[PDB]
Amino acid sequence: DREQLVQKARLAEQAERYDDMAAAMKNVTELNEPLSNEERNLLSVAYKNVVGARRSSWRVISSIEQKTEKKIEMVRAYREKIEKELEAVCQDVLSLLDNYLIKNCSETQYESKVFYLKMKGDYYRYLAEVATGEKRATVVESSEKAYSEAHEISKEHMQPTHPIRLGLALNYSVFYYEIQNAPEQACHLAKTAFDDAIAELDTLNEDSYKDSTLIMQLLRDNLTLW
Amino acid sequence: VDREQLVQKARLAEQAERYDDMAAAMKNVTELNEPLSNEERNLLSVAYKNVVGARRSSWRVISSIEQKTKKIEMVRAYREKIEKELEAVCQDVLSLLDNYLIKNCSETQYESKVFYLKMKGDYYRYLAEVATGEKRATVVESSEKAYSEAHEISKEHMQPTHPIRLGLALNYSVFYYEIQNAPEQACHLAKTAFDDAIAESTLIMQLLRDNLTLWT
Amino acid sequence: RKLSLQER
Amino acid sequence: KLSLQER
Numbered sequence A: 001d002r003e004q005l006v007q008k009a010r011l012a013e014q015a016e017r018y019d020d021m022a023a024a025m026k027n028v029t030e031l032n033e034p035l036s037n038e039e040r041n042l043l044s045v046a047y048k049n050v051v052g053a054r055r056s057s058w059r060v061i062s063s064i065e066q067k068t069e070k071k072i073e074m075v076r077a078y079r080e081k082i083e084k085e086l087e088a089v090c091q092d093v094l095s096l097l098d099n100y101l102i103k104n105c106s107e108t109q110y111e112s113k114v115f116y117l118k119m120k121g122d123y124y125r126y127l128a129e130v131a132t133g134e135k136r137a138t139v140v141e142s143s144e145k146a147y148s149e150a151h152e153i154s155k156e157h158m159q160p161t162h163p164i165r166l167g168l169a170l171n172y173s174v175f176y177y178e179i180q181n182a183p184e185q186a187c188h189l190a191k192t193a194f195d196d197a198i199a200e201l202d203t204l205n206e207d208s209y210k211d212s213t214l215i216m217q218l219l220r221d222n223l224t225l226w
Numbered sequence B: 001v002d003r004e005q006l007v008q009k010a011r012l013a014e015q016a017e018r019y020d021d022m023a024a025a026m027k028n029v030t031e032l033n034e035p036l037s038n039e040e041r042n043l044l045s046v047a048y049k050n051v052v053g054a055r056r057s058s059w060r061v062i063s064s065i066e067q068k069t070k071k072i073e074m075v076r077a078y079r080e081k082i083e084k085e086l087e088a089v090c091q092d093v094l095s096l097l098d099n100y101l102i103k104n105c106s107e108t109q110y111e112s113k114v115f116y117l118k119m120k121g122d123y124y125r126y127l128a129e130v131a132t133g134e135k136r137a138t139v140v141e142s143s144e145k146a147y148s149e150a151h152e153i154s155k156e157h158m159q160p161t162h163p164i165r166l167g168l169a170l171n172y173s174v175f176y177y178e179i180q181n182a183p184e185q186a187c188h189l190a191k192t193a194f195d196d197a198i199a200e201s202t203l204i205m206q207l208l209r210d211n212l213t214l215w216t
Numbered sequence C: 001r002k003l004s005l006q007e008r
Numbered sequence D: 001k002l003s004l005q006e007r
């Protein structure tokens, strides 16, 4: 029963065993029933913690590899070893987003849909972070659509003070900056997000102020140093 | 694969938190039956203690969640799963110690010997942290015997300010407090260690010392 | 810190 | 923690 599976995921979150929480949330989303917003966030941050651990470790052991006869072969093997783990978890959650969580949202569910599409774009960006040449272009395309579509959708059905829309705009801006290597478009979208957001600071709800104000502030920050 | 390559693998795995990989590489480093350097022994200890400490911390938060509460069968199954993982890694490090490290210590390799016996007592205390009934009595008795031999060699052939002796004394106090529920004996052990170390490395004694003012 | 949204 | 940590 999912009623206790979500509780197991919450217990794993409390236990900082993010693999177990991501597994429980994978089970509850494989049960084909639609996901609550808090269960949405549970699965999202569980899987993002799981992949970000390997992201950080990959960063450190590839930075030292680029910094530097027989040990360099082993550090390259280790980088490939955890790269085949990062890509594995990425594709796992990507097919979780394709077979479920997207086909299970009608037109009246714009919010959840752009949530999952930003998830898809983020994980494809993480895949492109470790891809080279022919393996890169493809995912850089698969991210782009998965981003842009999402953008368009909530440019049509929710005001730019929503934390989900602002988070999608922020991840899109840093995708344009880091991967697409286009600081112009990144700065542009950061500006169109933050300005449109502050234009209606009235709509900041009592239960959504912290998240938005944070994301708007970090969008502004990224805009400063660029 | 050359042993230096494995040592580098686990040294860099510490910079990536792959403490499972660190512990595995250093376990395979101990499994060539050659005694370890100070650095290699220390980072083996670090890796294994880090993984068992993750297990311990999340087990503790699970057991604390298990108290203030139906849907508890799942909580108990999760706690037992964490217990199984914990005692698995504990039996792994204990079998490493008994078969390779404590045995390759000569009858007067004093510092390394007391180090490994304090480690054995620590991991048996970790086993007792989650053990039940007589299965708990046996492991607390084994930890007591390990700490006993370690403390004998600590008092006789060692300086009363040696950080290894001080660490054995601190963990012996923590064992007597958190396992035997005898704060008298724990405070007494800590007091004797501190009052033998004051005569003449710093942090650790303060650590022991910091426990004293936390119990008084 | 990190450019992207640090989602815990 | 109360014992001897990271060692």
Ligand SMILES: C=CC(C)(C)OC[C@H]1O[C@H](O[C@@H]2C3=C([C@H](C)COC(C)=O)C[C@H](O)[C@]3(C)/C=C3/[C@@H](COC)CC[C@H]3[C@@H](C)[C@H]2O)[C@H](O)[C@@H](OC(C)=O)[C@@H]1O
Binding pocket: A038, A039, A041, A042, A044, A045, A115, A116, A118, A119, A163, A164, A165, A167, A168, A210, A211, A214, C006, C007, C008
């Ligand atoms: C359900 C609780 C869990 C899963 C533990 O956290 C999910 C979090 O979900 C909400 O915050 C979300 C959001 C978080 C906020 C940005 C951080 O909250 C604060 C005050 O710091 C962090 C999470 O990663 C999360 C859910 C991510 C999303 C992102 C969707 O990615 C797929 C788009 C923006 C952001 C939205 C969904 C935010 O609403 C809530 O406002 C948070 O409440 C608190 C205490 O901050 C809660 O922690």
